[PDB]
Amino acid sequence: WKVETNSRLDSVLLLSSMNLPGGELRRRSAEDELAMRGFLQEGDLISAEV
RNA sequence: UUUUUUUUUUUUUUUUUUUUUUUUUUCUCCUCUUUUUUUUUUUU
């Protein structure tokens, strides 16, 4: 994703670092990549750490 | 007669655009004197 945080550039939120739905150890593969662009859609608000 | 362990050079690229020299001011302004105006003519 690309996040705007009033900086000189854009900030990148990698898919590898995200608490995906389920919130536990089940699996992480390319099947999630199709629905990753579904829940964190355009114009949402997050609160993360650099 | 002095062993064992302490990772490293950001990820990304396959974006659209249908105009045209210049460009924008300055006011009214007393002309002195022999004249009517000479004139054909010929040699270029």
Side-chain angles (χ1 to χ4, degrees):
Chain A
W1 298 271
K2 308 283 289 178
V3 189
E4 193 262 335
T5 54
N6 273 321
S7 46
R8 326 210 294 280
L9 276 170
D10 263 358
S11 54
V12 174
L13 172 71
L14 275 190
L15 159 69
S16 309
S17 312
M18 180 46 169
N19 265 28
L20 275 165
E24 59 97 21
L25 170 80
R26 40 156 296 266
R27 205 180 36 247
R28 296 200 80 182
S29 296
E31 65 265 352
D32 308 300
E33 193 163 30
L34 262 64
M36 72 84 88
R37 308 175 283 179
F39 75 109
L40 272 176
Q41 62 156 357
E42 297 278 349
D44 276 2
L45 294 174
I46 72 151
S47 78
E49 163 200 339
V50 168

